């Protein structure tokens, strides 16, 4: 029982640490707002900085788009090969039945 | 001889199915390309409209004069007023509400972690139960958990 | 798990309320000069009409994106059935040649 | 929308700055709890999965512990009887080795 309460305390430590790390994972985008925080500090004409941030975001989004497209192609390739194996197994199994 | 004839007929039917599905896939790919072009046209139009609105309003919104800035504070205060059940919520007394709601939030997180611990142990116990079930099924086949 | 789902919902709501209160605290300064005012609605007519047209365009873009995604889907299943037919035909052809 | 609707009036900018400050606070809090001054948003995922493995180890441990405690409900008599049976079969043995 003593070891078990100790293990429960250790599990609580792990839980809190993991929850904190997850929370920062969620706030991942917020760290990108460092530009937004710096931009907001302009307190004056700041449309050019907005446009620069928008261009950077466009570049990032295009990179992510290409990454997603190529990954989708790879996943589709894997899916066709899996389906081909499925059909081949069906045919071989049916022949084994018949033989 | 008869067996090979049957398989040849099977192959003929499979070839017909392959032709049909190839035609269907070609039509689907043509439609997919058409919809890609249509979509890209829609984002092009949306971006053009956004840029043109930006250009038109360039002069309008530059001279904000930090005077229409405070309505944002008004909307934030009101949004908290409905979100936080505190119609008397004032920017003066909103700090006591801030600290009290932060205390509630941290208490909720602690209770959430407490529930999470027991949830994880229970789910893993069910996982071992399931593993026993799969081992039994593979060894013997279908059977209920009670018989396990 | 049901109880933990409810607890997570409550935690999310509490976090949102706390963030709203933090927002009030931050914008107390902006409230400070709430007496200020300025001109408004100079070019609102054309701006409002263009905003309406842009909203229409954005809605059309959302429809277009949804149709694009779904069509990608059906094309995917068509390719999968095509690959399944390919595998079946190849296996049966191999088996006929063997016989 | 912010550039097109510059009448937005930096409200979204204010919210994003507040979110940035909150993220800074959260990152500091994690660096404290996890005791990882060496940490970045880009590589925090690696420590997250590492401590996920850590938490899985702890939970699996405590799961075996829960089963052992639950079966510990067995009364004192069963342990004695099993111990004496093992003794009579093999000869005198320790309870730990029994």
Strand content of chain A: under 5%
How far is the N terminus from the C terminus of chain A?
A: 62 Å
Major interchain interface with per-chain residue totals: B-C, 70 and 62 residues
Shape of chain A: flat
Outline the structure in words.
The structure is cut from a larger assembly and holds 4 copies of chain A. With about 100 residues, chain A is mainly alpha-helical. In chain A, about 90% of the residues lie in helices and about 0% in strands. The first copy, chain A, has 4 helices and no strands. Chain A has helices spanning about 1-25, 30, 35-40, 45-99. The radius of gyration of chain A is 27 Å and the shape is flat. Chain A starts with a helix and ends with a helix. Chains in contact: A-B, A-C, A-D, B-C, B-D, C-D. Chains A, C: It is found in: Cytoplasm, Nucleoid.
